């Protein structure tokens, strides 16, 4: 059923899974119109899917095209994410397809259900986590991919880097879940801890710096502070 | 005008037919129910004072054969049975009546309750949602289950509806699922009334047969039938206007039926709000939405 605390280690088993978040697809500025009254402008948007286990993020592109002309585009984008994530499952091989999907949203429930009636035994499951993806488009090279594209277009990224080489998916998960949380509850304070020392670069091949064992452990508790105290600076604590 | 006459009444009973009832007492002389009006189905039931537990009873047409009640002490009900012999069973009446020992079916002349109730219900569409071919009458109780509550187990004791499912492949045509989903035009025209009801009659028929089910006997999963057939014509943007208007007289008089102690059960809260405030169909029921909201205001 739904995903949460008391089942977490189940998303690093040998059960092929994806994560689908919808939080980045329909992106719009709302902006004046000369007239004084207000407008959306659509931009590029994403869908978020992603193997917890094993890194592999399938970055679906939604190109503003596909909502011209188009009405209830929130309701749209749910329907558009399912559309293309049932489009994902079944380019893969039958051994690659996941044995359940987790929507971040339940109002993607539906959706997906109905796209996915074709694979009956899928589970489509919700989750009582908060989780950060919609801080995904706060990765530099994940937001460039997007807002350059002139077409649809999918592309293939591991968002652990190469961390698999020296942890386990249960600590790469927990460190993502970490600098997205950061970068979503203060962007350009999780951004200067992650960049503030010019020695250590992002490989051309990854998103993320090539820190040290040593050097993430400083960074994971640079995260968590900001974190503690951005909660501070909203509750008053 | 016909006759359902009883052998006896050995156990204290409230007995049903149609929207009236009548209690007998434990081996109180009663031998039956007379005038009893020709040209619709009709529903004879019954609650033992012992055990409140299993309500059942018999739909049946007069026009189909000469039908009585027997008390089975095996079984323990009271069953329906034809009698072939039609002057053993004339005999056998007219005896009853001369000796005043049955009630009469007692309908106000202004009154067309039942014809509303039953108007597009058939005895032989009732026969196959009810599956026993050797008798022309069909039994019904309180724990019988339905075809789509055995997918989700006897199943010659099931109640056949038609089975209804919003996300299921019959329902959502391949790359129309947003259109297909939001908008239930497809299945209730093309795949229900023209593919399977074949007539928006035969619809409403099954609609109204499991409406009665669900008041008469407590059945659950006629209840889930009527509002699940209710549900896919309001979330349908495209409906017949003769249907509409069929519909609201349909559940008017079903929501005017339903006495006051029983709807909290019954109505399902989700699907009347959503049929009635949210729907396509929103604004094309105005007489069930006046009804229901001077009778059960709380549910809204
Ligand atoms: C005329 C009195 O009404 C009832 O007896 C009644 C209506 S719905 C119901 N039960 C539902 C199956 C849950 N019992």
Redo the contacts with the bound molecule.
């Keep these: 059923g739904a995903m949460n605390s008391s089942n977490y280690a189940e998303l690093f088993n040998n059960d092929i899974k994806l994560f689908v978040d919808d939080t980045n697809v329909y992106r719009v500025t709302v902006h004046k119109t000369f007239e004084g009254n207000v407008a959306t402008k659509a931009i590029n948007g994403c869908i978020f899917t992603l193997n917890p286990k094993t890194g592999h993020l399938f970055l679906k592109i939604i190109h503003t095209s596909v909502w011209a002309g188009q009405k209830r585009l929130s309701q749209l984008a749910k329907w558009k994410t399912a559309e293309e994530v049932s489009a994902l499952v079944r380019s893969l091989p039958k051994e690659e397809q996941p044995k359940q999907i987790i929507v971040t949203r339940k109002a993607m429930l539906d959706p997906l259900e109905v796209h996915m009636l074709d694979f009956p035994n899928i589970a489509i499951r919700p989750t009582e986590l908060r989780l950060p993806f919609s801080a995904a488009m706060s990765i530099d090279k994940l937001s460039d991919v997007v807002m350059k594209a002139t077409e649809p277009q999918m592309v293939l990224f591991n968002i652990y880097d190469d961390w698999l080489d020296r942890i386990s998916s249960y600590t790469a998960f927990s460190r993502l879940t970490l600098l997205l949380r950061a970068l979503k509850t203060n962007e350009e304070s999780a951004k200067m801890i992650l960049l503030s020392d010019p020695t250590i670069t992002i490989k051309s091949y990854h998103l993320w710096p090539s820190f040290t064992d040593e050097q993430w452990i400083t960074i994971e508790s640079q995260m968590r502070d900001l974190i503690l105290t951005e909660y501070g600076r909203k509750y008053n604590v | 005008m016909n006759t359902v006459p009883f052998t006896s009444a050995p156990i204290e009973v409230t007995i049903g037919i149609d929207q009236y009832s009548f209690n007998v007492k434990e081996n109180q002389p009663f031998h039956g129910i007379k005038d009893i009006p020709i040209g619709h189905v009709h529903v004879i039931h019954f609650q033992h004072a012992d055990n409140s537990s299993m309500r059942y009873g018999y739909w049946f047409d007069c026009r189909m054969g000469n039908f009585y009640i027997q008390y089975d002490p095996k079984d323990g009900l009271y069953k329906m049975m034809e009698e072939r012999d039609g002057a053993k069973f004339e005999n056998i009446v007219h005896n009853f009546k001369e000796r005043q020992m049955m009630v009469s079916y007692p309908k106000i002349d202004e009154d067309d309750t039942w014809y509303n109730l039953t108007e597009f219900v058939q005895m032989d569409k009732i026969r196959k949602i009810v599956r026993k071919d050797e008798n022309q009458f069909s039994y019904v109780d309180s724990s019988m289950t339905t075809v789509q509550e055995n997918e989700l187990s006897d199943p010659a004791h099931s109640l056949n509806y038609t089975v209804i499912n919003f996300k299921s492949r019959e329902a959502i045509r391949p790359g129309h699922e947003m259109e297909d989903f939001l908008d239930k035009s497809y299945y209730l025209n093309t795949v229900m009334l023209q593919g399977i009801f074949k007539n928006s009659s035969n619809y409403f028929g099954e609609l109204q047969f499991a409406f009665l089910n669900?008041?008469?006997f407590?059945?659950?999963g006629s209840?889930l039938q009527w509002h699940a057939m209710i549900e896919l014509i309001c979330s349908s943007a495209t409906v017949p206007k003769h249907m509409l208007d069929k519909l609201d007289e349909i559940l008017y008089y079903q929501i005017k039926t339903?006495?006051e102690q029983?709807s909290d059960?019954?109505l399902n809260e989700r699907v009347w709000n959503i049929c009635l405030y949210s729907s396509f169909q929103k604004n094309s029921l105005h007489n069930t939405e006046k009804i229901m909201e001077n009778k059960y205001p709380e549910l809204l």
Excluded: E, H
Aim: proline share 8%; no cysteine; net charge neutral.
């Design positions: 669900a008041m008469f407590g059945n659950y209840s339903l006495p029983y059960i019954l």
